[PDB]
């Protein structure tokens, strides 16, 4: 899946081919192909433990925004999975 604050995902939008022209005429060749985001894991600490983020390179620092936001936040309770969920 895509997931994460990007709220991004894959799209099937068409990929086609056209042998050039413009000063004469341009060809055709179609097909349907998949487009994917640039999602990568993201390590981060948050005081205790680490936690990964399958987020896209568009909104990477949003985590570092999110982290730098979670200053005075009741962050612990022994709940690492629960922390990510609580990350806004």
């Amino acid at each position: 899946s895509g997931k994460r604050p990007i709220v991004a995902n894959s799209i099937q939008r068409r990929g086609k081919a056209k042998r050039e022209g413009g000063v004469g005429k341009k060809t055709t060749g179609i097909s349907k192909r998949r487009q994917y985001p640039n999602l990568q894991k993201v390590r981060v600490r948050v005081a205790g433990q680490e936690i990964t983020f399958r987020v896209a390179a568009s909104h990477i620092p949003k985590v570092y925004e999110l982290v730098e936001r979670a200053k005075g936040l009741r962050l612990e309770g022994l709940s690492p999975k629960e922390i990510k969920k609580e990350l806004l």
């Binding site: 600490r45 990477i60 620092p61 570092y64 925004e65 730098e68």
Partner: protein, 145 residues
């Protein structure tokens, strides 16, 4: 990436000079290893208010001496103590020097904040070097009889 550091790494500058670095250099290094901070508008004027404090703090702790420097030096200090007539019987201690202000001149000054490595055992209108802050050296007039 505009970020400020707090350990002067002589490759990107001394503490205080924000620097643009490659994001990876900041993503997988600095902040995790407690070397720098993401200087956001929030974390700008945050610590920018800090430097607006200590740099201005040295005023209610600095001039507070000068409002007493050119005032305290315009006075004596007399410690009447029975003693010999060329060397004191006993001694006079900085710890005890302070309360001499309390039993006559009614001022509260700190002991060990006073230059006196050893106690004085002989008399004479002697003059000491009090410290209210390691910046405004004030010389203190004392006397024993």
């Amino acid at each position: 990436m505009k970020v400020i550091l707090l350990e002067p790494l002589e490759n990107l500058g001394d503490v205080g000079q924000v620097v643009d670095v490659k994001p990876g250099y900041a993503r997988n290094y600095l902040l995790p290893r407690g070397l720098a901070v993401l200087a956001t508008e929030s974390n700008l004027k945050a610590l920018e208010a800090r430097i607006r404090a200590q740099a201005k703090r040295l005023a209610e702790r600095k001039a507070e001496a000068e409002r007493l420097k050119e005032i305290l030096e315009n006075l004596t200090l007399t410690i009447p103590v029975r003693a010999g007539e060329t060397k004191i019987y006993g001694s006079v201690t900085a710890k005890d020097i302070a309360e001499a202000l309390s039993r006559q001149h009614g001022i509260t000054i700190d002991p060990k904040r006073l230059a006196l490595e050893k106690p004085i055992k002989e008399l004479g209108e002697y003059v000491l070097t009090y410290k209210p802050h390691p910046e405004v050296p004030i010389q203190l007039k004392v006397s024993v009889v």
